[PDB]
Design a protein around this ligand. Structure first.
Ligand code: CA
Ligand code: CA
Ligand code: CA
Ligand code: ZN
Ligand code: ZN
Lengths: 610, 615
């Protein structure tokens, strides 16, 4: 065979085809025999489906990399939840095997992120920022903000960490620097001038995490935000031009954490005491403008803030309402509970921050000297002083969740007879639930849970799930009734689920008024037995308040809180794997790893040409 | 330029030279395009004196670590707890990162793996095994052993996983094939003449982990107890052909590190009940019995070779040691696992004891006890049977625990100091007050001079830091009679000459000096003891002291070591277990142990640790 022989006998045997390739290459390629036999080797290896050896060959012939850049290394290090011990061991090992040192040694990451973490890119503002120190190079800071440790006084008992909000934002923007310049180039706009009038709208959000087995209670609260839109109004005479709208704000892959507090959602004192910094600097932000070094030039930025991502309970407890099922229910309309049953559609949005402060002041002073309940009424029941701003809108997920649980219960009830038997008893409810679970399991292959997450909800909204259910309905009238109800629901739901209804499906949106009206009509007429005076919140939102906000603020579901809560399982796992561990640090390093896992840059390096 | 053109257009452009090379291979080389173009590209690279790229090109066929040797990658996965999802992720990551295939994808790595688990190599056994399925290709079996699930009878819920013991063997042996062959190469022993006379020595151990913690188990899913029965190949020598009773072809270099301790079976049942434990281990024990006589035939290194084994059952702790010997528990008159003496006769004399205990004679004593062929009364019969009360079931030569091996000695020297600050043979019976007093003054003394806090229980390191001539001569300051000071000082010094004799791996090559003096040294020790502290050992003697002053020479003669048979190893390996359950359970106890065992067995292969060079 040719492969076991020496080069003397090999070249002696092959000299005919060697000079054949020689003359043919001097004929076609002009003095390039090496690339000719390279293309011959590539074709002979690809014809046999051994693409792997051809790829190794092409990675040898001027191959991109023997060893990797420290950046993508840090990416792999975090984006798979590996320990530092783990990475070092793997590193030594692989460096032994054929190793031209491939990964980077652990040491080099610890000063390779100084380019990605907060507190590294100089900047300033005009005017100078009020009540917020003009020192920038700092990074992570303990979350107490100098709580005078005196024992007898109010205790110093909370463990928390956070950033300077502004440093977080500038990290985020200087991070997106690449994409913003690329988009400016894509919009074909000039790049040197018109570099002083960008408007970046970015949503904040905050929700908790209860009962964590701690290594002060078990619960915890995480506070994050995500950049949504970056647009330009320059040079003027126009409203603006969107430079970069985020494509997938729902996925936690864009949910950058900004503070963490080992406390509970209810301890209003402790929560505000830690949050004062955050609120105050958010306040000072919206005034001035921001100068960074970006695109090679000193560029300017303004800001607006959309506070969306909160479950209801939080919104109430932070807007100073009465959570959660009391007389006042609509976080937007001043309607009482019961009147939202006879009428369900026309409800103007009124609730707003400034007037809520006004109403609280009216409560405190009581200039009219009214008695208790008229005082509740004239102020429309705003007793607690709100402290944090809110944008007036609802989460996208928990609408789905509440609708799911309500349909679940309405099925459990329509299994039996409640308009034939007005007040059923508890055991009948348990049995109807049991036969409902049997129906949902025998068909559709669905198992019960304690509480319904998003996936169980999405499963419980298929029309065929309602078909399998309604088989047990005795009255075929009521059967078709809930079928038409479900149909209306399916036609109307993807409106708020949509990321952009003005681009997804404007048809249901334009047909949403009449669809909602017909929905409320069927619900009342065939089901007043149950919604005489008691109605639920998200239902009220979706049958009374969807069209207003969908008209005004571009899109809902776009501002899903889904991201923060959904992603919070990252806070679950990080605590396990990469802990320090000691709660003095546990936060600090968790937050570090989190934000690291959050920036675009390493996600980009994770994609690596699809 | 030809380097930038697409492959469809470059095929259309070089199709004519493609037909030229095709007909050249058809006429001269038999129609092979690949070898032709490979040697062509080699001789074109070597024309530019570019030797490095040419040698990479040539080795890339059948060498160079193609992107990396897939076996190495499976290892580096296991050796770091790295989970499948992770692996795939970072794999795509690095491949799409830099233009190459560095690691191998899963499916192929795992197909390659299937050559390392049990149940992959043929073998034979001459003569055939006794009542053992002739099949050879099976793998991870269920340890219930076909338990008829009928509700009425004792339930069959106990979940277990294990191996056909023989197959686990043939796996571990086919692993250490490489080492036995290289060792035959160093010893220069012939090969067509070393095919038969082989003997492998097998160590074993079995302990259980308490109430293991796990995640997402707020209610009981019996995720608490686990008893991991395991073994580890100890040595291999030769027996062909003349006298040559043994040439140690391979002796393990460190039998304690769990890196070398292979698992055999895992059972979600506490060591408590005899029921389930015998229920599962029965198959294993019967197999071990049927594996002593007949000879195992292995296709190793290209040769069909014969193998016999010797079996030692060691790595058990005192509790289960009794529980598989049929003795009572625990600290009754019968105290020594080897010298069947009681406390009082061990207090009269302390070193004249012959190892008489053996599994067979204990079986015999059990028959004696059950029949009572003399109709003797209860207690008198238990005396005449000497500790054997329950039918033992598991042959196992016990040995002194190399782990504690000191703790009774430590508490004894502690009591010595506490009673020497007192004048205990001047006031023969003190109550609790002077007891706590002497304790406190002694502990303040130790903290003053050697800087050690007092403790409630004696671990290892406290004992080590306590058996220091420094602590002894420093606490001598408190005892008034210098006669007794020299007494306890000679005590400590003899103890310090004699403890490394057993603590070490093998004195026959480490320190034979104290070994050849050991019987005499221990005799002087017992003399000093029953001379100056006979007030203290009238008839009350603790266990560890009998064991240490008892038989160490007899053991190291019958065996050749102590630390080379301890169960310390398994106590480390439990850590492994935990972590694996933490990071590789499949979330179903029906599948859990199967997965855990698979990964662990991978983690304990001499093959894969050998791929852990770490230079
Ligand atoms: Ca939530
Ligand atoms: Ca134990
Ligand atoms: Ca144990
Ligand atoms: Zn309303
Ligand atoms: Zn003896």
């Amino acid at each position: 065979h040719l492969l076991s022989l020496t080069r003397r006998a090999q070249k002696h045997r092959l000299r005919d085809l060697k000079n054949q390739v020689k003359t043919f290459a001097e004929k076609e390629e002009g003095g390039d025999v090496k690339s000719v036999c390279l293309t011959l080797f590539l074709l002979a290896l690809r014809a046999g489906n051994e693409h792997r050896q051809a790829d190794e060959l092409e990675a040898m012939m001027q191959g991109r990399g023997f060893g990797l850049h420290p950046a993508v290394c840090l990416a792999i290090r975090v984006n798979t939840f590996l320990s530092c011990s783990q990475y070092h061991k793997m590193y030594r090992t692989v460096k032994a095997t054929s190793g031209r040192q491939i990964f980077q040694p652990l040491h080099t990451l610890r000063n390779a992120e100084k380019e990605l973490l907060p507190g590294f890119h100089q900047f300033e503002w005009q005017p100078a920022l009020k009540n917020v120190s003009t020192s920038w190079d700092v990074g992570i800071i303990d979350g107490l903000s100098g709580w005078t440790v005196s024992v007898d006084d109010v205790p110093a008992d909370t463990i928390s960490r956070r950033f300077r909000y502004d440093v977080a934002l500038v990290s985020a923007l200087k991070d997106l620097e690449e994409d913003i310049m690329e988009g400016l180039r894509e919009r074909a706009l000039d790049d040197s001038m018109c570099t002083s009038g960008f408007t970046v709208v970015v949503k904040e959000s905050c929700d908790g995490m209860g009962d964590v087995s701690e290594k002060v209670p078990e619960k915890a609260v995480r506070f994050s935000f995500t950049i949504m839109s970056i647009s330009i109004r320059l040079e003027g005479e126009d409203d603006g031009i969107t430079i970069f709208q985020e494509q997938k704000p729902n996925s936690e892959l864009s949910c950058r954490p900004l503070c963490l507090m080992f406390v509970d959602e209810s301890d209003h004192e402790t929560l505000t005491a830690i949050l004062g910094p955050v609120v105050a600097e958010r306040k000072a932000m919206m005034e001035s403008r921001l100068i960074i070094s970006v695109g090679g030039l000193l560029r300017s930025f303004r800001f607006f803030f959309r506070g969306t991502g909160y479950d209801e309970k939080m919104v109430r407890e932070m807007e100073g309402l009465e959570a959660s099922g009391s007389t006042y229910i609509c976080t937007l309309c001043d309607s009482t509970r019961a009147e939202a049953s006879q009428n369900m559609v026309l409800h103007s949005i009124t609730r707003s921050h400034d007037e809520n402060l006004e109403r609280y002041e009216i409560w405190r002073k009581n200039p009219f000297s009214e008695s208790a309940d008229e005082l509740r009424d004239r102020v429309k029941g705003v007793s607690a002083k709100p402290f944090m701003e809110t944008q007036p809108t609802l989460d996208a997920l928990h609408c789905d969740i509440g609708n799911a649980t309500e349909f679940y219960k309405i099925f459990q009830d329509e299994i039996g007879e409640v308009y034939q038997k007005p007040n059923p008893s508890r055991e009948e409810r348990r049995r109807w639930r049991s036969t409902l679970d049997k129906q949902l399991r025998k068909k559709m292959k669905l198992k019960p849970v304690m509480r319904m997450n998003g996936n169980y909800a999405r499963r419980l909204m298929t029309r065929e799930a309602v078909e399998a259910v309604c088989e047990l309905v005795p009255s075929e009238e009521r059967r078709e009734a809930l079928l038409k109800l479900m149909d209306l629901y399916l036609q109307m739901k993807p409106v708020w689920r949509s990321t952009c209804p003005s681009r997804d499906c404007p048809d249901q949106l334009c047909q949403y008024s009449y669809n909602s009206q017909q929905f409320a009509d069927l619900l009342s007429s065939m089901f007043k037995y149950r919604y005489d005076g008691k109605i639920t919140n998200y239902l009220h939102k979706t049958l009374a308040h969807v069209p207003e906000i969908v008209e005004r603020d571009g899109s809902i579901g776009a501002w899903a809180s889904e991201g923060n809560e959904s992603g919070n399982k990252l806070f679950r796992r990080f605590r396990k794997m990469n802990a320090r561990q000691s709660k003095t640090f546990e936060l600090e390093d968790i937050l570090k790893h989190h934000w690291l896992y959050t920036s675009k840059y390493l996600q980009k390096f994770m994609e690596a040409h699809k | 330029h030809l380097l930038s053109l697409t492959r469809r257009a470059q095929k259309h452009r070089l199709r004519d030279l493609k037909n030229q090379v095709k007909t050249f291979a058809e006429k001269e080389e038999g129609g092979d395009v690949k070898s032709v173009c490979l040697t062509l590209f080699l001789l074109a690279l070597r024309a530019g004196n570019e030797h490095k790229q040419a040698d990479e090109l040539e080795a890339m066929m059948q060498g160079r670590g193609f992107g990396l040797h897939p076996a190495v990658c499976l290892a580096i996965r296991v050796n770091t707890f790295l989970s499948c999802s992770q692996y795939h992720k970072m794999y795509r990551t690095v491949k799409a990162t830099s233009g190459r295939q560095i690691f191998q994808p899963l499916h192929t790595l795992r197909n390659a793996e299937k050559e390392l688990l049990p149940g992959f190599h043929q073998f034979e056994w001459q003569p055939a095994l006794k009542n053992v399925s002739t099949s050879w290709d099976v793998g991870i079996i269920d340890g219930l052993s076909g338990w008829t699930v009928s509700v009425d009878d004792v339930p069959a819920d106990t979940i277990s996983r294990r191996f056909r013991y023989d197959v686990a063997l043939v796996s571990a042996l086919k692993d250490l094939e490489e080492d036995i062959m290289e060792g035959l190469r160093e010893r220069a022993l012939d090969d067509s003449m070393c095919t038969s006379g082989f003997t492998v020595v097998v160590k074993e151990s079995c302990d259980g982990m308490g109430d293991v913690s796990e995640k997402h188990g707020s209610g009981p899913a019996v995720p608490e107890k686990a008893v991991r029965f395991s073994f580890t190949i100890m040595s291999i020598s030769i027996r062909l052909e003349g006298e040559d009773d043994g040439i140690t072809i391979f002796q393990e270099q460190k039998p304690n590190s769990e890196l070398s301790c292979r698992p055999l079976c895992l059972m979600f049942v506490d060591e408590s009940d005899h029921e389930t434990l015998t229920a599962i281990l029965g198959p294993v024990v019967a197999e071990r019995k049927a594996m002593m006589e007949s000879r195992l035939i292995i296709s190793v290194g290209g040769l069909l070779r014969s193998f016999r084994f010797f079996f030692r059952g060691t790595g058990y702790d005192e509790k289960m040691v009794r529980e598989m010997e049929g003795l009572e528990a625990s600290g009754s008159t019968y105290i020594c696992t080897l010298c069947d003496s009681t406390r009082a006769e061990a207090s009269q004399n302390m070193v004249l004891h012959s190892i008489t205990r053996s599994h067979d004679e204990n079986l015999e004593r059990y028959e004696i006890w059950r029949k009572n062929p003399f109709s003797e009364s209860a207690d008198e019969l238990r005396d005449r049977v000497k500790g054997v009360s329950a039918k033992p079931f598991m042959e196992t030569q016990p040995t002194l625990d190399a782990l504690h091996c000191d703790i009774g000695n430590a508490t004894e020297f502690y009591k010595i100091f506490q009673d020497e600050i007192g004048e205990v043979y001047q006031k023969p019976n003190p109550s609790r007050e002077e007891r706590r007093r002497w304790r406190s003054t002694l502990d303040k003394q130790l903290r003053k001079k050697m800087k050690l806090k007092p403790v409630m229980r004696m671990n290892g390191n406290y004992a080590r830091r306590l058996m220091t001539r420094e602590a002894v001569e420093a606490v001598c300051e408190l005892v008034p009679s210098e006669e007794r000071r020299e007494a306890l000082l000679k005590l400590m010094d003899l103890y310090l000459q004699m403890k490394p004799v057993w603590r070490s791996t093998c004195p026959s090559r480490d320190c034979p000096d104290q070994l050849c003096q050991y019987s005499y040294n221990s005799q002087q020790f017992a003399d000093l003891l029953s001379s100056m502290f006979k007030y203290r050992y009238d008839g009350k003697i603790t266990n560890y002291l009998h064991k240490t002053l008892a038989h160490v020479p007899e053991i190291v003669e019958r065996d050749g070591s102590i630390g080379a048979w301890a169960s310390e190893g398994n106590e480390s390996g439990n850590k492994l277990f935990r972590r694996f359950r933490k990071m590789n359970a499949r979330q179903s106890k029906t599948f859990e142990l199967e997965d855990i065992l698979k990964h662990h067995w991978l983690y304990t292969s001499k093959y894969l640790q050998k791929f852990m060079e770490a230079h």
